[PDB]
CSV table of C-alpha atoms in Angstrom, one decimal:
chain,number,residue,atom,x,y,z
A,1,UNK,CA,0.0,0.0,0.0
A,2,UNK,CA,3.0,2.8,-1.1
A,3,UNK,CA,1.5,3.2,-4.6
A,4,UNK,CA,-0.6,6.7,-3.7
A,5,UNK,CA,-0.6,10.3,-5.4
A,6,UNK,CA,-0.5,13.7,-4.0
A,7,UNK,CA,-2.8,15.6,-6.2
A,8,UNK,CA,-5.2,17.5,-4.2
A,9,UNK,CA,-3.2,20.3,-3.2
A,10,UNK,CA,-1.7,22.2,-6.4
A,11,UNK,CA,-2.1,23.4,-9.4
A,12,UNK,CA,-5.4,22.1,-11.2
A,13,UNK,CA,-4.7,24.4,-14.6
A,14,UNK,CA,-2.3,22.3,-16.7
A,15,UNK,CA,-3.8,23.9,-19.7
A,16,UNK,CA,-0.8,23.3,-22.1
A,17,UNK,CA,-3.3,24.7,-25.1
A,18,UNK,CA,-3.8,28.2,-25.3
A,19,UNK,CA,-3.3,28.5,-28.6
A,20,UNK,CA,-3.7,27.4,-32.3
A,21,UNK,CA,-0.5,26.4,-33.8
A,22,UNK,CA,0.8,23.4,-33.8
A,23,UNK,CA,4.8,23.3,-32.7
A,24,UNK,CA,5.7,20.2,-34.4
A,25,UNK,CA,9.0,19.4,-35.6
A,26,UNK,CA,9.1,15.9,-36.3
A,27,UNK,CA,9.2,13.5,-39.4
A,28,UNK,CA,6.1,12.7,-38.7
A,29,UNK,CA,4.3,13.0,-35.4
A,30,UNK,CA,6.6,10.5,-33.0
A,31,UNK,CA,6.0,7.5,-31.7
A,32,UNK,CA,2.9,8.7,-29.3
A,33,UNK,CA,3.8,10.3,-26.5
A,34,UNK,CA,5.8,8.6,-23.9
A,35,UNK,CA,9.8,7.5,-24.2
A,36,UNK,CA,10.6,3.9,-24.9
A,37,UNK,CA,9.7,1.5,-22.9
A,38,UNK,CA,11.9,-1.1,-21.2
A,39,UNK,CA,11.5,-4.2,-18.8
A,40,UNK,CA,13.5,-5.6,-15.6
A,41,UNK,CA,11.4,-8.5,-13.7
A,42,UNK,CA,12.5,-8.1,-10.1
A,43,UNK,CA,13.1,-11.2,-7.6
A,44,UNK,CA,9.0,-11.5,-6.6
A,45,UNK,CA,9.4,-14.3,-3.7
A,46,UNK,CA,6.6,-16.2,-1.9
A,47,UNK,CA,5.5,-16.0,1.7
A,48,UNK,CA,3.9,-19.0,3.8
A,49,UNK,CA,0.9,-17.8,6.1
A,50,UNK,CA,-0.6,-19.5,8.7
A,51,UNK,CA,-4.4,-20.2,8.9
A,52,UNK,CA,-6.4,-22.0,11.3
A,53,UNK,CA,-7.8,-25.3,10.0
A,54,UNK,CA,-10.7,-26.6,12.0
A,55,UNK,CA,-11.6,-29.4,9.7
A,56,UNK,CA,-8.0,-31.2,10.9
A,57,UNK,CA,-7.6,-33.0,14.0
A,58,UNK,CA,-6.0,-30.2,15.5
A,59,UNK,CA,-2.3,-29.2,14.9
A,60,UNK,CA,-2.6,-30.8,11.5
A,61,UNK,CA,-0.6,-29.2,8.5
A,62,UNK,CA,-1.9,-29.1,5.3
A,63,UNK,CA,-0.1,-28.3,2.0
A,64,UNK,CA,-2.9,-26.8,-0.2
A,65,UNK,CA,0.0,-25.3,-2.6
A,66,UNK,CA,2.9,-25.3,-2.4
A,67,UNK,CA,4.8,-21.6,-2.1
A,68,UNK,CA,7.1,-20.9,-5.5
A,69,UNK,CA,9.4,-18.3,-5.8
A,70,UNK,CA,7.8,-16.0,-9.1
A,71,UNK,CA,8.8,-13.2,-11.2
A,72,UNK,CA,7.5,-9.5,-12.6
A,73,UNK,CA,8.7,-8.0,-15.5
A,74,UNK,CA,9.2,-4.7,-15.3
A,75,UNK,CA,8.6,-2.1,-17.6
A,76,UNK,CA,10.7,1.3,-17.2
A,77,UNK,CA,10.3,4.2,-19.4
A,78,UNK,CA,13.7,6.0,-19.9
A,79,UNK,CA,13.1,9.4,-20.4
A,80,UNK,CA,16.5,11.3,-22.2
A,81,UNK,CA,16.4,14.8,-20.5
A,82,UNK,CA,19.3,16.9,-20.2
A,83,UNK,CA,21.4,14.4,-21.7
A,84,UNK,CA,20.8,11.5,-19.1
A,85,UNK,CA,18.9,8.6,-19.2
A,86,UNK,CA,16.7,8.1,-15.9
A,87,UNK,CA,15.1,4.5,-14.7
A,88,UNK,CA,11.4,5.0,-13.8
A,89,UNK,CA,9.0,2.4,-13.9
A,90,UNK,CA,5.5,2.4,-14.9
A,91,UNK,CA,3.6,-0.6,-15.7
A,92,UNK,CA,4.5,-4.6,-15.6
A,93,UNK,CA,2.4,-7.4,-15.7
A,94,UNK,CA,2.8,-10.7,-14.0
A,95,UNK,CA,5.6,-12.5,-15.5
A,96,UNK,CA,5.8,-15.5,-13.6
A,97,UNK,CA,3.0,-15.0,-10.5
A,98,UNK,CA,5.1,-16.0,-7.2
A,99,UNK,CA,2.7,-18.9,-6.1
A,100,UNK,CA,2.1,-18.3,-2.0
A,101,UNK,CA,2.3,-21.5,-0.1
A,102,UNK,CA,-1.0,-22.3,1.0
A,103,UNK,CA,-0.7,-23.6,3.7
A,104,UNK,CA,-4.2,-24.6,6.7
A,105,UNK,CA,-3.2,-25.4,10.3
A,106,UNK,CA,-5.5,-27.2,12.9
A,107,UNK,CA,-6.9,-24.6,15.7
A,108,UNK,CA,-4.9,-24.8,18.9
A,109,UNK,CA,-7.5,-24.4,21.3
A,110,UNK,CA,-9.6,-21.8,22.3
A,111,UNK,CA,-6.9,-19.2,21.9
């Protein structure tokens, strides 16, 4: 829960069209918008939990699934500005879902 914005506290203007001439210098009209996009999948590892399992006999494991170490690739946008090339990512999808180990152990007790 670190993804989170700030906007709701500055300037709400960001006109960027007050006029009616284009300033296009381009072949044709770039590639869209945005810099290239690149891709790094970062180490995405698992995590066991521990739930309570009532249908056991009591401190009874049970290994639903297995936890597997997964992957992410992700996709940067490196924007050349001022004659430097900066890392910021953007948007990845799933490349290789890190499986969590599902694991369901019997209730202790009443506590």
């Amino acid at each position: 829960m670190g993804s989170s914005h700030h906007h709701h506290h500055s300037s709400g203007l960001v006109p960027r069209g007050s006029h009616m001439s284009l300033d296009e210098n381009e072949v044709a009209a770039n590639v869209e918008t945005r810099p290239e996009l690149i891709t790094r999948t970062e180490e995405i590892p698992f995590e066991v939990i521990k739930k309570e399992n009532p249908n056991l006999p009591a401190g009874q494991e049970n290994i639903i699934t297995a936890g597997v170490k997964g992957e992410r690739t992700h996709y940067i946008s490196v924007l050349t500005e001022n004659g430097k090339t900066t890392e910021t990512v953007l948007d990845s999808q799933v490349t290789k879902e890190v499986i969590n180990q599902v694991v369901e152990v019997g209730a202790p007790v009443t506590h």
